[PDB]
Amino acid sequence: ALKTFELRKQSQENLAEQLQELRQELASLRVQKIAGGSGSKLSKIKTTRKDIARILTVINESNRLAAREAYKNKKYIPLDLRQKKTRAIRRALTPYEQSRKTLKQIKKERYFPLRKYALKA
């Protein structure tokens, strides 16, 4: 099984060039197994499905990372490159605008803030 470590230090075109070679290989084993396949064929399929998944991950990981870099310091970015969390969290007041106060209130907390004190018994 190819490791993700050396699957992440090559370009996409050759990385996509590894996609179809694994695709027909998986397809070929299915042809062999329906005409008589040993236990290795079941594993060789099982190994190659995860192997196809591993390289598909690094294609999608790198493609998104390319999109994230391209849409850095942009005001509006695609919905895919955005936080999800929950729907209500995305609608709540941001911490900045929850901290907004009128200039009347700023003068209250500047001249008369809650003091730190103690009572001697």
Binding site: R115, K116, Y117, A118, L119, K120
Partner: protein, 116 residues
């Protein structure tokens, strides 16, 4: 519907843990604010003295504490209550004055621009 009190000892513990939670945040200052001394409003109870809601503005002015400073050092203000007699005024003015004697107010850092 029948209300049951099986959470009675669990409410006692929960309320005590809130007092400990509150005291941890505000370490040396009292867990309660000082309350005035008032007299209940009936012929059945006007001889008793109990605690009020807050000190009147005329009581704070005599004690020397402004209504804006008062809230910041744990002295509640009751804009509704008034002093119809000199005994209520003096009973609660002394209460504020005693409170100020036993009070340590820790200094605050102040923004200070260079000139002007």
């Amino acid at each position: 519907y029948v209300k049951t009190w099986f959470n009675q000892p669990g409410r006692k513990l929960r309320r005590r843990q809130a007092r400990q939670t509150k005291a941890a945040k505000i370490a040396p200052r009292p867990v309660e604010a000082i309350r005035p001394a008032v007299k209940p409003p009936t012929i059945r109870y006007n001889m008793k003295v109990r605690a009020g809601r807050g000190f009147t503005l005329e009581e704070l002015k005599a004690a020397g504490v402004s209504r804006r400073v008062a809230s910041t050092i744990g002295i509640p203000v009751d804009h509704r209550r008034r002093n119809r007699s000199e005994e209520s005024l003096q009973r609660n003015v002394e209460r504020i004055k005693v409170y100020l004697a036993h009070l340590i107010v820790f200094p605050r850092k102040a923004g200070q621009p260079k000139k002007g």
